[PDB]
Amino acid sequence: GSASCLELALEGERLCKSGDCRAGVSFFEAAVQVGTEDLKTLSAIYSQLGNAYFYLHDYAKALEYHHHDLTLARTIGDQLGEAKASGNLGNTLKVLGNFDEAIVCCQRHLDISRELNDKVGEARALYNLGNVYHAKGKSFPEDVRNALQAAVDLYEENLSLVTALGDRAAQGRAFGNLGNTHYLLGNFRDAVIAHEQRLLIAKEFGDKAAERRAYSNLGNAYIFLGEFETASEYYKKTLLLARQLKDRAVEAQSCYSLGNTYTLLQDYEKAIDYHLKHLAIAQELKDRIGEGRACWSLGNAYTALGNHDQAMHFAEKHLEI
C-alpha cells in the first residue's frame, strides 16, 4: 500500500497548493489510512496535514500532526525534518498561547538550522521566534516590555540575514511586524520607519493587501505622533485600496478611522460623512457592534457642532444596541 499512499498524498499536495485544504486533508488522511513502510513519506504527510489544519484554523489537530512529525523526525534521525517540525510545532503553540513551549520549539528550529549551516532556515526561525515574543508581550509590566524588546532584536537579526540572502518577501514580513512592535513599545518614529519599508516592498511585489496594511499601520503611528492630518491622509489611501480590493469590512474600517481622525482635527462635517459611510457599510455586513459604535460616533459629532435633535436620534439608536 506504499504506491497507493504515495499517490493519495500527491492528490492532497496538489489540492492544498490548489488552495483548497479541505479536500487535500481528506486525501492525506486517506494516505495515512493506507499506510507505508517509508517513514520519511509519513513524516511529509504528517507535516502537510499539520500545515493544512493550521491554515484551516484547527489548531488542536495542527498541534497533534506536527508533534507526530517531530517525534518521527527524531526516530529516523532526520535533522532538517526535526528542525522543520519543531518550527511548525512552535508556531502552532504560539497561536494556542503556550509561549514558553513555542519559544523552546522555535529556538530548536533556529539551533538546528545553524548546525546545518542552513541560512534560509535560520532566518525563518528568527522571524517565527520574534513573532512568539511579540504575541507574548501583546497578550499581556516589565515582562511585557522585555518580551517586546526581544521581538525587536529578533526581527532586526532576521532583517540583517535576509538582506544578505536577498529575500524581499522576508524583509516585508519582518518590517511590518517590527513596526508593530515599536508601535506597542511606544516608539512611533521607529514604527513609521519600519512600516515605510514594508510599504515600499508591498508596492514592489504588487501586493495590495500588504500595501493597505502598511498604510493602516502608518496612520496609527501618526495618531500617537499627534499629527492628525498626516494620519487622515494615509487612511484616505486605505479607503481607496479597500474599494479597489472589493473589501467592504476594510472599507468600513477605513471610514471609521477617518471619522475619528477628523474628530481630532475638529472638522465634524467630514467626520459625520465618513461615520455615515461606516454606519451604512456596517448594517450592510450585519455588524451590530460597529453599528452602535457608528451611532455613538455620530451622536458625538452632531453634539460637537450643537445639532440638537439629530444627536438624540443616534443616541436612542445606539441605546437599542
Binding site: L6, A9, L10, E13, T41, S43, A44, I45, S47, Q48, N51, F54, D69, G81, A83, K84, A85, G87, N88, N91, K94, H109, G121, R124, Y127, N128, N131, G172, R173, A174, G176, N177, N180, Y183, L184, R198, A210, R212, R213, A214, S216, N217, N220, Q253
Partner: peptide
C-alpha cells in the same frame, strides 16, 4: 487595529525534484 504579517511554516513533500 494593528495589521500583522502572517506566519511562515516549513513544508515537506513526498517527492523531491
Amino acid at each position: 487595529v494593528m495589521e500583522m504579517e502572517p506566519e511562515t511554516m516549513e513544508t515537506k513533500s513526498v517527492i523531491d525534484s
